[PDB]
């Protein structure tokens, strides 16, 4: 049989992984710019802790 | 198929055959003016319609056994359950939990005026 | 000898020695044939011709 | 509607205001989305951000029909979200319009029986013969590999299946799963009134009518000549043509 | 402009995004369910092509 | 078909043979004859190259 | 269709498949029990064969 049955979670599937698996990746990163621009904050000054209650 | 109302039927097991083994199901039918509480098989019955539902089939055809089966189904409500809900259970609420920052967001803080690495 | 030959029929025909038991001289058909109704002489050819 | 399941045009539409939720807050998290807006006029302080809500939802809308928006990430923060967004709608399109070929032209659901052998195996599909018939008589009397064990069945089931008429043959297929051996000139003519019954499978065997005398009768030549007179003239045709014109029946496609 | 509209509307039929995306909401969903109309007649026509 | 006849087997005008050909022929078709014959003759290499 | 539409198969692919295209020629081996079978059967198929 070449019949119907469209496609479920059973046959696409996995790319409701990667894309999870990809946001989760992207905050991990929103937290590394995060964190790599407080170093260049720390150009002039202080030892960055106060600046992330500021700021944020 | 018998013409009176008296039905005689006997086994005969004298010795080891007597382990053989037959069971029956007559139908008391009538005359194919059916009228009243008469599914009419054609097959010349005129059964009573008791034996509707009953999961024995009276006539050739399982005329009477049939069309006896009504449910209620739907599209996605065929997987709403105990099972297949603990994922649209959950993550209908974590789109919930992010629409309710996104809006938090937008109105609280604007887009413009001086808002490095804010929130 | 029957040293020359090898093969299927060579490594039943020294198994089926060690379950009967007999001494045998492997001789090639002459004919190189198998065998058949010639349908004009009525004979027979071949391997079924020598036996 | 149909090439994808209904519960996965949900998964679709809750990722669709999933990641554009997502995306909206990392786009203000991020200290590399947050820009100077003057090119002319770099040293001031207006730094701004291009996404807002409705920015970040026609992101995702956008990059979901395909067409694009013109919000363009620009933190490598924003640019996995979108990046990644645009991986999941080139899956979701090119597995919903490989499926579409499926669903517009694939087949025809064809009937379970196609001819003989096919009611001489299928024993769900109940067969069916008129009561003094020379259709009947055909199985009763041949022996060819099926015609015998088409006639094991109506033999074993003659108070079911052979009915007294051809119209009890047409209500037995209008109501029951029957599978009615009629000849094949009021197959012609019970398909042209009623549309929804069909001749599913060829001719097995030939023969013909007959305007038949007693033994010895002096009318079986002169019958025939007046038969070959009105077919040679075509009379034969405006006779048939009249009576088994039926009410039109649709071929459809 | 009633030029602009039709370039709009040509566009997104063509899968080709013109220079013009629209703002204001109201017109977000106009231009938002005209991509969803062509994104159907395409994805049904390439697959009926064959 | 533009009309419809059939191939009749001639006897001249008054033979007996008619009858006894008739009452044969109506045999072979119900036994299968007629058609078993007419596959072996009008059957070969059936154009399969349209498809 | 130029990716995965069908693998290019053989002309013939059984018996009858022989008894049909006359341009794919036979073959047998004289003094066979093959071509013995061919000679002396007459299944529909394996006398056309050996025609
Ligand atoms: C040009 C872009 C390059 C991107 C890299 C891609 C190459 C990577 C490939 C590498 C080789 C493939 C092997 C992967 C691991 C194998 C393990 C496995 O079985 O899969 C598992 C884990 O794997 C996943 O979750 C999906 C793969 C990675 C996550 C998404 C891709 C990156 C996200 C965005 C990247 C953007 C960042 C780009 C740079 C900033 C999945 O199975 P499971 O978790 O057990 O699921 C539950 C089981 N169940 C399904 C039955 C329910
Ligand atoms: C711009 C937006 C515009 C939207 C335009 C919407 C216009 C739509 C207008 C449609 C008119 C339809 C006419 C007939 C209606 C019958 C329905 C039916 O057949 O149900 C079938 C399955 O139904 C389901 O599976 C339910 C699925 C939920 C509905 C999804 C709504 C889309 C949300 C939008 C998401 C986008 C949101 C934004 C995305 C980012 C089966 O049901 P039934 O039992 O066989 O029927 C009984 C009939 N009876 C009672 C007579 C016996
Ligand atoms: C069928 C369609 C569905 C899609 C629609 C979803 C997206 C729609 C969300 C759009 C969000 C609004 C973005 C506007 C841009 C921000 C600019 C700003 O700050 O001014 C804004 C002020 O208003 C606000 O500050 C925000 C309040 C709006 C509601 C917040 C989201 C509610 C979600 C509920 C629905 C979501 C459920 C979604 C379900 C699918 C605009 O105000 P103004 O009139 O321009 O005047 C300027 C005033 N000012 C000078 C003080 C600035
Ligand atoms: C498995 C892990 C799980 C957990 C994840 C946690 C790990 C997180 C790891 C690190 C977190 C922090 C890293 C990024 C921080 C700043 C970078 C930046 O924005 O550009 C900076 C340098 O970048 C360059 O321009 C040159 C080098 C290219 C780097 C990116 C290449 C992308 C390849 C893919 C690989 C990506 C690497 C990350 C891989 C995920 C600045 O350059 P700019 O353009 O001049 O700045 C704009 C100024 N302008 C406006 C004047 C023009
Ligand atoms: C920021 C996060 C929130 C925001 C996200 C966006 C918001 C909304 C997003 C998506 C909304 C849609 C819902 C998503 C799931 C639905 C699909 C589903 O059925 O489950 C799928 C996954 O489910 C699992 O089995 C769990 C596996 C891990 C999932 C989480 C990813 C963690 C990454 C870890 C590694 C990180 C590595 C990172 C570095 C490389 C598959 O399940 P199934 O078993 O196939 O189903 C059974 C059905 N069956 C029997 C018929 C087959
Ligand atoms: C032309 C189409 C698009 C092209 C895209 C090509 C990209 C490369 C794509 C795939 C390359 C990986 C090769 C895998 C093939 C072997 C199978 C395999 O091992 O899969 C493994 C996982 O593998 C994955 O899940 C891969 C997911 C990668 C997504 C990348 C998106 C890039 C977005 C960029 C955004 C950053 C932007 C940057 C910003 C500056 C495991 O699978 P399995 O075990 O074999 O089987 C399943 C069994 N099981 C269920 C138990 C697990
Ligand atoms: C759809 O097809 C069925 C045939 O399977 C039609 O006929 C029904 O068949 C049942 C038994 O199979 C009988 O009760 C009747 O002959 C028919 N019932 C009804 C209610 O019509 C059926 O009519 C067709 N149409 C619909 C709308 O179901
Ligand atoms: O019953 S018949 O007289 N003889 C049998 N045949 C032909 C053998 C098919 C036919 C074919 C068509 C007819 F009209 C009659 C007959
Ligand atoms: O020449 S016949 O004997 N008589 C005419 N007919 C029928 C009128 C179609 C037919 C139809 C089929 C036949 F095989 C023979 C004849
Ligand atoms: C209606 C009936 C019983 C008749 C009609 N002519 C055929 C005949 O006279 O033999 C029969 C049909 C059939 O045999 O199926
Ligand atoms: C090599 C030949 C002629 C022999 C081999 N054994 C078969 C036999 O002994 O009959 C034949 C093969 C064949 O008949 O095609
Ligand atoms: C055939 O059956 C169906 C069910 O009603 C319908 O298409 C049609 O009305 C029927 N035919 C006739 C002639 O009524």
Same mark, same amino acid.
């Given at each position: 049989s070449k019949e119907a049955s469209a496609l479920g979670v059973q046959n696409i599937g996995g790319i409701f992984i990667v894309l999870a698996a990809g946001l989760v990746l992207s905050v991990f990163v929103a937290v590394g710019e995060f964190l790599y621009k407080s170093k260049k904050n720390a150009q002039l000054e202080k030892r960055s802790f106060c600046s992330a209650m500021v700021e944020e | 198929m018998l013409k009176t109302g008296v039905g005689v039927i006997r086994m005969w097991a004298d010795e080891g055959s007597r382990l053989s083994r037959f069971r029956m199901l007559f139908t008391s039918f009538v005359e194919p003016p059916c009228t009243s509480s008469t599914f009419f098989c054609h097959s010349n019955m005129c059964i009573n319609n008791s034996l509707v539902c009953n999961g024995v089939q009276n006539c050739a055809y399982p005329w009477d056994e049939n069309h006896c089966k009504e449910k209620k189904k739907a599209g996605l409500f065929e997987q709403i359950t105990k099972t297949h809900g603990t994922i649209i259970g959950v993550t209908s609420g974590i789109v919930l939990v992010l629409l309710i920052i996104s809006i938090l967001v937008q109105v609280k803080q604007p887009r413009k005026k001086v808002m490095a690495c804010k929130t | 000898g029957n040293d020359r030959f090898e093969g299927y029929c060579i490594d039943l025909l020294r198994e089926l020695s060690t379950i009967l038991g007999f001494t045998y001289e492997i001789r090639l058909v002459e004919d190189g044939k198998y065998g058949a109704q010639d349908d004009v002489n009525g004979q027979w050819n071949g391997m079924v011709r020598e036996l | 509607l149909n090439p994808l399941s209904p519960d996965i045009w949900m998964y679709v539409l809750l990722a669709c205001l999933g990641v554009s939720c997502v995306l909206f807050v990392i786009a203000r998290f991020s200290p590399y989305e947050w820009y100077n807006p003057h090119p002319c006029n770099? $040293?001031? $302080?207006?730094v701004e951000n291009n996404f807002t809500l409705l920015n970040s939802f026609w992101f995702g809308v956008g990059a979901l029909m395909q067409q694009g928006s013109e919000l363009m990430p620009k933190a490598l923060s924003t640019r996995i979200v979108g990046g990644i967004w645009w991986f999941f709608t080139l899956i979701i399109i090119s597995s919903y319009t490989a499926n579409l070929a499926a669903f517009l032209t694939v087949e025809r659901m064809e009937s379970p029986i196609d001819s003989a052998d096919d009611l001489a195996k299928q024993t769900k599909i109940e067969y069916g013969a008129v009561e003094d018939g020379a259709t009947m008589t055909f199985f009763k009397k041949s022996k060819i590999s099926t015609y015998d064990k088409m006639w094991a069945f109506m033999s074993s089931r003659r108070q079911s299946v052979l009915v007294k008429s051809n119209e009890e043959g047409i209500q037995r297929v209008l109501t029951s799963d029957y599978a009615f051996l009629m000849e094949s000139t009021t197959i012609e003519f019970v398909t042209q009134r009623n549309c929804n019954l069909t001749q599913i499978g060829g001719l097995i065997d030939s023969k013909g009518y007959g305007v038949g005398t007693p033994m010895g009768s002096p009318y079986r030549d002169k019958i025939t000549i007046a038969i070959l007179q009105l077919q040679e003239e075509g009379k034969l045709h405006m006779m048939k043509e009249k009576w088994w014109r039926g009410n039109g029946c649709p071929e459809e496609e």
């Open positions: - | - | - | 770099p $040293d001031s $302080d207006v």
